[PDB]
Design a protein around this motif. Structure first.
Motif, PDB file in Angstrom:
ATOM      1  N   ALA A   1      41.036  20.099  27.522  1.00 25.71           N
ATOM      2  CA  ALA A   1      40.421  18.922  28.146  1.00 25.71           C
ATOM      3  C   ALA A   1      40.050  17.880  27.092  1.00 25.71           C
ATOM      4  O   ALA A   1      38.936  17.359  27.063  1.00 25.71           O
ATOM      5  CB  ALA A   1      39.193  19.314  28.974  1.00 25.71           C
ATOM      6  N   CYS A   2      41.017  17.563  26.216  1.00 23.61           N
ATOM      7  CA  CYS A   2      40.749  16.754  25.026  1.00 23.61           C
ATOM      8  C   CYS A   2      40.439  15.296  25.325  1.00 23.61           C
ATOM      9  O   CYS A   2      40.093  14.559  24.393  1.00 23.61           O
ATOM     10  CB  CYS A   2      41.944  16.808  24.080  1.00 23.61           C
ATOM     11  SG  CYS A   2      43.482  16.143  24.810  1.00 23.61           S
ATOM     12  N   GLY A   3      40.579  14.850  26.570  1.00 22.26           N
ATOM     13  CA  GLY A   3      40.299  13.451  26.848  1.00 22.26           C
ATOM     14  C   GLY A   3      41.247  12.526  26.101  1.00 22.26           C
ATOM     15  O   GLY A   3      42.456  12.769  26.004  1.00 22.26           O
TER      16      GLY A   3
ATOM     17  N   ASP B   1      45.032  17.655  28.448  1.00 24.46           N
ATOM     18  CA  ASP B   1      44.078  17.116  29.416  1.00 24.46           C
ATOM     19  C   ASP B   1      44.778  16.915  30.754  1.00 24.46           C
ATOM     20  O   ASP B   1      45.980  16.640  30.806  1.00 24.46           O
ATOM     21  CB  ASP B   1      43.433  15.808  28.911  1.00 24.46           C
ATOM     22  CG  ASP B   1      42.129  15.449  29.653  1.00 24.46           C
ATOM     23  OD1 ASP B   1      42.198  14.899  30.781  1.00 24.46           O
ATOM     24  OD2 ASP B   1      41.027  15.738  29.124  1.00 24.46           O
ATOM     25  N   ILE B   2      44.025  17.089  31.846  1.00 21.07           N
ATOM     26  CA  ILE B   2      44.621  16.938  33.168  1.00 21.07           C
ATOM     27  C   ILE B   2      44.877  15.472  33.517  1.00 21.07           C
ATOM     28  O   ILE B   2      45.658  15.188  34.437  1.00 21.07           O
ATOM     29  CB  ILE B   2      43.743  17.622  34.232  1.00 21.07           C
ATOM     30  CG1 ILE B   2      44.570  17.909  35.494  1.00 21.07           C
ATOM     31  CG2 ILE B   2      42.515  16.780  34.545  1.00 21.07           C
ATOM     32  CD1 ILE B   2      43.904  18.870  36.463  1.00 21.07           C
ATOM     33  N   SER B   3      44.275  14.531  32.785  1.00 21.73           N
ATOM     34  CA  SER B   3      44.401  13.105  33.084  1.00 21.73           C
ATOM     35  C   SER B   3      45.551  12.507  32.287  1.00 21.73           C
ATOM     36  O   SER B   3      45.470  12.393  31.061  1.00 21.73           O
ATOM     37  CB  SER B   3      43.105  12.363  32.773  1.00 21.73           C
ATOM     38  OG  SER B   3      43.321  10.957  32.775  1.00 21.73           O
TER      39      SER B   3
ATOM     40  N   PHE C   1      42.414  24.807  33.264  1.00 17.23           N
ATOM     41  CA  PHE C   1      41.455  25.692  33.917  1.00 17.23           C
ATOM     42  C   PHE C   1      41.987  26.346  35.178  1.00 17.23           C
ATOM     43  O   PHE C   1      41.658  27.500  35.442  1.00 17.23           O
ATOM     44  CB  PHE C   1      40.173  24.933  34.299  1.00 17.23           C
ATOM     45  CG  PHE C   1      39.489  24.234  33.154  1.00 17.23           C
ATOM     46  CD1 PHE C   1      39.575  24.711  31.852  1.00 17.23           C
ATOM     47  CD2 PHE C   1      38.725  23.103  33.400  1.00 17.23           C
ATOM     48  CE1 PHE C   1      38.922  24.065  30.804  1.00 17.23           C
ATOM     49  CE2 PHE C   1      38.069  22.443  32.365  1.00 17.23           C
ATOM     50  CZ  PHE C   1      38.172  22.918  31.057  1.00 17.23           C
TER      51      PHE C   1
ATOM     52  N   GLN D   1      35.218  20.124  24.367  1.00 19.31           N
ATOM     53  CA  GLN D   1      34.009  19.307  24.286  1.00 19.31           C
ATOM     54  C   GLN D   1      33.682  18.678  25.633  1.00 19.31           C
ATOM     55  O   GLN D   1      34.526  18.003  26.243  1.00 19.31           O
ATOM     56  CB  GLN D   1      34.153  18.205  23.234  1.00 19.31           C
ATOM     57  CG  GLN D   1      34.771  18.663  21.897  1.00 19.31           C
ATOM     58  CD  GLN D   1      33.878  19.600  21.084  1.00 19.31           C
ATOM     59  OE1 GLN D   1      32.757  19.904  21.461  1.00 19.31           O
ATOM     60  NE2 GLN D   1      34.401  20.082  19.965  1.00 19.31           N
ATOM     61  N   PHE D   2      32.445  18.905  26.089  1.00 18.09           N
ATOM     62  CA  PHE D   2      31.896  18.263  27.290  1.00 18.09           C
ATOM     63  C   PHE D   2      32.795  18.449  28.510  1.00 18.09           C
ATOM     64  O   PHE D   2      32.963  17.537  29.325  1.00 18.09           O
ATOM     65  CB  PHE D   2      31.622  16.776  27.014  1.00 18.09           C
ATOM     66  CG  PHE D   2      30.688  16.571  25.860  1.00 18.09           C
ATOM     67  CD1 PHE D   2      29.344  16.924  25.965  1.00 18.09           C
ATOM     68  CD2 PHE D   2      31.151  16.088  24.643  1.00 18.09           C
ATOM     69  CE1 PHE D   2      28.471  16.767  24.875  1.00 18.09           C
ATOM     70  CE2 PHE D   2      30.291  15.914  23.569  1.00 18.09           C
ATOM     71  CZ  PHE D   2      28.946  16.268  23.679  1.00 18.09           C
TER      72      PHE D   2
ATOM     73  N   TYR E   1      33.357  22.266  34.038  1.00 19.98           N
ATOM     74  CA  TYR E   1      34.220  22.042  35.194  1.00 19.98           C
ATOM     75  C   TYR E   1      34.998  23.298  35.583  1.00 19.98           C
ATOM     76  O   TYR E   1      35.368  23.443  36.753  1.00 19.98           O
ATOM     77  CB  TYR E   1      35.182  20.869  34.939  1.00 19.98           C
ATOM     78  CG  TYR E   1      34.421  19.584  34.647  1.00 19.98           C
ATOM     79  CD1 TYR E   1      33.517  19.068  35.569  1.00 19.98           C
ATOM     80  CD2 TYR E   1      34.580  18.922  33.438  1.00 19.98           C
ATOM     81  CE1 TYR E   1      32.791  17.918  35.299  1.00 19.98           C
ATOM     82  CE2 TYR E   1      33.864  17.764  33.157  1.00 19.98           C
ATOM     83  CZ  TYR E   1      32.971  17.272  34.093  1.00 19.98           C
ATOM     84  OH  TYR E   1      32.254  16.133  33.821  1.00 19.98           O
TER      85      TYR E   1
HETATM   86  N1  LIG Z   1      41.355  21.442  34.958  1.00 19.94           N
HETATM   87  C1  LIG Z   1      41.336  20.615  33.911  1.00 19.94           C
HETATM   88  N2  LIG Z   1      42.276  20.761  32.945  1.00 19.94           N
HETATM   89  C2  LIG Z   1      42.254  19.924  31.901  1.00 19.94           C
HETATM   90  N3  LIG Z   1      41.418  18.922  31.642  1.00 19.94           N
HETATM   91  C3  LIG Z   1      40.496  18.803  32.610  1.00 19.94           C
HETATM   92  C4  LIG Z   1      40.392  19.585  33.744  1.00 19.94           C
HETATM   93  N4  LIG Z   1      39.311  19.177  34.512  1.00 19.94           N
HETATM   94  C5  LIG Z   1      38.795  18.177  33.842  1.00 19.94           C
HETATM   95  N5  LIG Z   1      39.476  17.883  32.686  1.00 19.94           N
HETATM   96  C6  LIG Z   1      39.145  16.869  31.691  1.00 19.94           C
HETATM   97  O1  LIG Z   1      37.853  17.139  31.206  1.00 19.94           O
HETATM   98  C7  LIG Z   1      37.447  15.970  30.459  1.00 19.94           C
HETATM   99  C8  LIG Z   1      35.940  15.822  30.495  1.00 19.94           C
HETATM  100  C9  LIG Z   1      35.299  14.784  29.578  1.00 19.94           C
HETATM  101  N6  LIG Z   1      33.846  14.755  29.940  1.00 19.94           N
HETATM  102  C10 LIG Z   1      35.420  15.120  28.095  1.00 19.94           C
HETATM  103  C11 LIG Z   1      36.699  14.666  27.410  1.00 19.94           C
HETATM  104  C12 LIG Z   1      36.695  14.876  25.892  1.00 19.94           C
HETATM  105  N7  LIG Z   1      36.672  16.327  25.555  1.00 19.94           N
HETATM  106  C13 LIG Z   1      35.470  14.180  25.289  1.00 19.94           C
HETATM  107  O2  LIG Z   1      34.521  14.903  24.916  1.00 19.94           O
HETATM  108  O3  LIG Z   1      35.497  12.938  25.241  1.00 19.94           O
HETATM  109  C14 LIG Z   1      38.228  14.792  31.055  1.00 19.94           C
HETATM  110  O4  LIG Z   1      39.047  14.229  30.033  1.00 19.94           O
HETATM  111  C15 LIG Z   1      39.018  15.438  32.205  1.00 19.94           C
HETATM  112  O5  LIG Z   1      40.232  14.791  32.532  1.00 19.94           O
END
Ligand SMILES: Nc1ncnc2c1ncn2[C@@H]1O[C@H](C[C@@H](N)CC[C@H](N)C(=O)O)[C@@H](O)[C@H]1O
Length: 288
Positions: free
Chosen positions: A32-34, A54-56, A85, A109-110, A114
């Motif tokens: 979920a590296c954003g 990342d899923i996005s 996940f 991170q963060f 989820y």
């Molecule tokens: N099932 C999933 N698989 C992968 N990424 C996910 C999933 N659910 C949520 N995310 C990602 O979780 C991230 C949450 C963000 N708060 C953190 C992003 C990054 N790690 C940062 O700290 O900036 C977002 O980029 C989402 O798209």
């Protein structure tokens, strides 16, 4: 607006946490590296390969754009749109054979909370982690601290329909009061939903508690033992003396409080330093 100071604080926490477990030459998988905003931090640790998922797709496109803007890095960067996940990681990385698995480090991170939307998702995440990680490798990251959440929830009487707390710049609102109705205990470790308002925040999604005792006991079931559970406040206060002067001048200046000490201050202290905790596990056995 607290966003700039909170971003600087979290970048300092991540910098210290990455350095704590990452070694030169490591292969890192970041779940979920954003938008891939820790690349220079892993570069400072001297890694050999970074895999970020990342899923996005929008966020991965931005991470690609930021990466391609950098010059003459000594490490390979792989950036993948995929689900970390709710599906096997094999699906995400199938088309990326350059990934060097098993890796040395899995970071998140963060975002790991989820995965606690359901038990199925929490277990799929953990199986993803241990299948990717070398025996002896580390799994680390940053999550909302279920123990601070429970402290606040224990102060809220059952008469409150939607348990809530906060200050001028943030507010947590739970979807229901089943915690209080159940004698101040979550009826399930999974799917306990809340929303999180932060002044000037750019996103808003359903949040889930990640009860640390359930996190730890599932991690053990999958072969990992706890190494670190320090809240942001204790982690920062303990580590900052050894780091202040290793930071760049701009990183140090961004961490300045009004009194010249380093960290956050005033209304920022509770959402930035008490609401979140670090975590780290070491994979000590293969999973059967
Ligand atoms: N099932 C999933 N698989 C992968 N990424 C996910 C999933 N659910 C949520 N995310 C990602 O979780 C991230 C949450 C963000 N708060 C953190 C992003 C990054 N790690 C940062 O700290 O900036 C977002 O980029 C989402 O798209």
């Amino acid at each position: 607006s607290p966003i700039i100071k909170l971003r600087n604080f979290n970048n300092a926490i991540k910098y210290i946490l990455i350095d704590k477990f990452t070694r030169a030459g490591d292969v890192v998988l970041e779940l979920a590296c954003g938008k891939g905003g820790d690349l220079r931090k892993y570069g400072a640790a001297g890694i050999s390969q970074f895999i970020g998922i990342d899923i996005s797709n929008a966020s991965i496109t931005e991470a690609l754009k930021r990466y391609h803007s950098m010059k003459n890095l000594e490490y390979q960067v792989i950036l993948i749109t995929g689900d970390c996940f709710g599906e096997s990681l094999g699906v995400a990385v199938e088309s990326f054979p350059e990934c060097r698995f098993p890796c040395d480090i899995v970071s998140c991170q963060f975002a790991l909370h989820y995965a606690f939307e359901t038990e199925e998702k929490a277990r799929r995440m953990l199986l993803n982690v241990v299948k990717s990680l070398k025996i002896g490798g580390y799994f680390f990251g940053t999550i909302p601290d279920s123990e601070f959440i429970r402290y606040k929830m224990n102060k809220i009487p059952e008469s409150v329909e939607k348990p809530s707390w906060g200050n001028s710049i943030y507010k947590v609102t739970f979807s229901n009061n089943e915690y209080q109705k159940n004698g101040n205990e979550f009826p399930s470790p999974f799917g306990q939903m809340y929303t999180f308002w932060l002044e000037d925040a750019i996103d808003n999604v359903p949040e889930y508690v990640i009860p640390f005792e359930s996190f730890r006991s599932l991690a053990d079931e999958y072969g990992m033992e706890l190494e670190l559970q320090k809240g942001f406040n204790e982690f920062f206060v303990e580590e900052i003396p050894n780091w202040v002067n290793r930071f760049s001048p701009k990183m140090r200046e961004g961490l300045k409080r009004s009194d010249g000490r380093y960290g956050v201050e005033g209304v920022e202290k509770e959402p930035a330093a008490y609401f979140y905790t670090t975590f780290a596990f070491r994979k000590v056995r293969d999973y059967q």
